[PDB]
């Protein structure tokens, strides 16, 4: 049907926008602290702490799977990366401080991105 393809063309180019956003979010993580899931081999008790782990690699797989149906779902995943980190790691750790910076520096990018989405519908 002509309805699903035009729709697809939106879901597909929502995807296109969010990939752009994601690459900008990740550049705010130069040390690549959030690039990959926390190693369960290196932190075996991790899941006893964090019930919904998240990282940039995992977001990217969902992104390419066209798994984000809107910007809200995407931001939820971004938030998980930051909030997990600020619970698991103490305040005076390179980890915690890295999540604070990412959250602060990320906010303007998400600010823009929210304005583009409602714009192009
Ligand atoms: C995301 C997070 O909280 N990290 C702290 C633990 N480190 S680790 C296993 O020591 O390299 C990975 C990043």
CSV table of C-alpha atoms and ligand atoms in Angstrom, one decimal:
chain,number,residue,atom,x,y,z
A,1,UNK,CA,0.0,0.0,0.0
A,2,UNK,CA,1.0,3.6,-0.6
A,3,UNK,CA,0.3,4.3,3.1
A,4,UNK,CA,3.0,1.9,4.4
A,5,UNK,CA,5.8,3.0,2.1
A,6,UNK,CA,5.4,6.8,2.8
A,7,UNK,CA,5.3,5.8,6.5
A,8,UNK,CA,8.3,3.6,6.0
A,9,UNK,CA,10.0,6.6,4.3
A,10,UNK,CA,9.4,8.5,7.6
A,11,UNK,CA,10.4,5.7,10.0
A,12,UNK,CA,13.4,5.2,7.7
A,13,UNK,CA,14.3,8.9,7.8
A,14,UNK,CA,13.6,9.2,11.5
A,15,UNK,CA,16.3,6.6,11.5
A,16,UNK,CA,18.4,8.8,9.3
A,17,UNK,CA,18.0,11.7,11.7
A,18,UNK,CA,18.7,9.7,14.9
A,19,UNK,CA,21.9,8.1,13.4
A,20,UNK,CA,23.1,11.7,13.0
A,21,UNK,CA,22.3,12.6,16.6
A,22,UNK,CA,23.9,9.4,17.8
A,23,UNK,CA,27.2,10.1,16.2
A,24,UNK,CA,27.2,13.6,17.7
A,25,UNK,CA,26.3,12.2,21.1
A,26,UNK,CA,29.2,9.7,20.9
A,27,UNK,CA,31.7,12.4,19.9
A,28,UNK,CA,31.0,13.9,23.3
A,29,UNK,CA,32.5,10.6,24.7
A,30,UNK,CA,36.1,10.8,23.5
A,31,UNK,CA,37.4,8.3,26.0
A,32,UNK,CA,34.8,5.8,24.7
A,33,UNK,CA,33.8,5.0,28.2
A,34,UNK,CA,30.2,4.4,27.0
A,35,UNK,CA,31.0,2.8,23.6
A,36,UNK,CA,30.4,-0.8,24.6
A,37,UNK,CA,28.4,-2.7,27.1
A,38,UNK,CA,29.9,-3.0,30.6
A,39,UNK,CA,31.9,-6.3,30.5
A,40,UNK,CA,30.1,-8.9,32.6
A,41,UNK,CA,33.4,-10.9,32.6
A,42,UNK,CA,35.2,-7.9,34.2
A,43,UNK,CA,32.2,-6.8,36.4
A,44,UNK,CA,30.3,-10.1,37.1
A,45,UNK,CA,28.0,-8.6,39.7
A,46,UNK,CA,27.0,-5.7,37.4
A,47,UNK,CA,23.5,-7.0,36.8
A,48,UNK,CA,22.9,-7.2,40.5
A,49,UNK,CA,23.2,-3.4,40.4
A,50,UNK,CA,22.0,-2.2,37.0
A,51,UNK,CA,18.8,-3.9,35.7
A,52,UNK,CA,18.7,-2.3,32.3
A,53,UNK,CA,22.3,-1.9,30.9
A,54,UNK,CA,22.8,0.3,27.9
A,55,UNK,CA,25.7,1.6,25.7
A,56,UNK,CA,26.2,3.2,22.3
A,57,UNK,CA,26.9,0.0,20.4
A,58,UNK,CA,23.6,-1.5,21.6
A,59,UNK,CA,21.7,1.7,20.6
A,60,UNK,CA,23.3,1.6,17.2
A,61,UNK,CA,22.2,-2.0,16.6
A,62,UNK,CA,18.6,-1.0,17.6
A,63,UNK,CA,18.9,2.1,15.4
A,64,UNK,CA,19.9,0.1,12.3
A,65,UNK,CA,17.2,-2.4,13.2
A,66,UNK,CA,14.8,0.7,12.8
A,67,UNK,CA,13.9,-0.1,16.4
A,68,UNK,CA,13.3,3.5,17.6
A,69,UNK,CA,9.7,4.4,16.6
A,70,UNK,CA,10.2,8.0,17.9
A,71,UNK,CA,12.8,10.4,19.6
A,72,UNK,CA,11.4,9.6,23.0
A,73,UNK,CA,12.4,6.0,22.9
A,74,UNK,CA,15.9,7.0,21.7
A,75,UNK,CA,16.4,9.5,24.5
A,76,UNK,CA,15.2,6.9,27.1
A,77,UNK,CA,18.2,4.8,26.0
A,78,UNK,CA,20.6,7.7,26.2
A,79,UNK,CA,19.4,8.5,29.7
A,80,UNK,CA,20.0,4.8,30.7
A,81,UNK,CA,23.6,5.1,29.7
A,82,UNK,CA,24.0,8.2,32.0
A,83,UNK,CA,21.8,7.2,34.9
A,84,UNK,CA,23.3,3.6,35.2
A,85,UNK,CA,26.7,5.1,35.3
A,86,UNK,CA,25.9,7.7,38.0
A,87,UNK,CA,24.4,4.9,40.2
A,88,UNK,CA,27.1,2.2,39.7
A,89,UNK,CA,30.0,4.6,40.0
A,90,UNK,CA,30.9,6.9,42.9
A,91,UNK,CA,30.8,10.7,42.4
A,92,UNK,CA,34.5,11.2,42.4
A,93,UNK,CA,35.3,8.6,39.7
A,94,UNK,CA,36.4,9.3,36.1
A,95,UNK,CA,33.3,7.3,35.2
A,96,UNK,CA,30.8,9.3,37.0
A,97,UNK,CA,32.4,12.6,35.8
A,98,UNK,CA,32.4,11.3,32.2
A,99,UNK,CA,28.6,10.7,32.4
A,100,UNK,CA,28.0,14.2,33.8
A,101,UNK,CA,29.9,15.8,30.9
A,102,UNK,CA,28.1,13.6,28.3
A,103,UNK,CA,24.7,14.5,29.8
A,104,UNK,CA,25.5,18.3,29.9
A,105,UNK,CA,27.2,18.5,26.4
A,106,UNK,CA,24.5,16.2,25.0
A,107,UNK,CA,21.6,18.4,26.0
A,108,UNK,CA,22.1,21.0,23.3
A,109,UNK,CA,22.2,18.3,20.6
A,110,UNK,CA,19.0,16.8,22.0
A,111,UNK,CA,17.6,20.3,22.2
A,112,UNK,CA,18.1,20.7,18.5
A,113,UNK,CA,17.0,17.3,17.5
A,114,UNK,CA,13.6,17.7,19.3
A,115,UNK,CA,13.0,20.8,17.2
A,116,UNK,CA,13.8,19.1,13.9
A,117,UNK,CA,11.5,16.2,14.6
A,118,UNK,CA,8.3,18.1,15.3
A,119,UNK,CA,9.4,20.3,12.3
A,120,UNK,CA,9.6,17.6,9.6
A,121,UNK,CA,6.9,15.6,11.3
B,1,LIG,C1,29.9,2.3,32.0
B,1,LIG,C2,30.6,2.1,33.3
B,1,LIG,O1,30.0,2.3,34.3
B,1,LIG,N1,31.9,1.7,33.3
B,1,LIG,C3,32.6,1.4,34.6
B,1,LIG,C4,33.3,0.1,34.5
B,1,LIG,N2,34.2,0.2,33.3
B,1,LIG,S1,35.4,-1.0,33.3
B,1,LIG,C5,34.7,-2.6,33.2
B,1,LIG,O2,36.1,-0.9,34.6
B,1,LIG,O3,36.2,-0.8,32.2
B,1,LIG,C6,33.4,0.2,32.1
B,1,LIG,C7,32.6,1.5,32.0
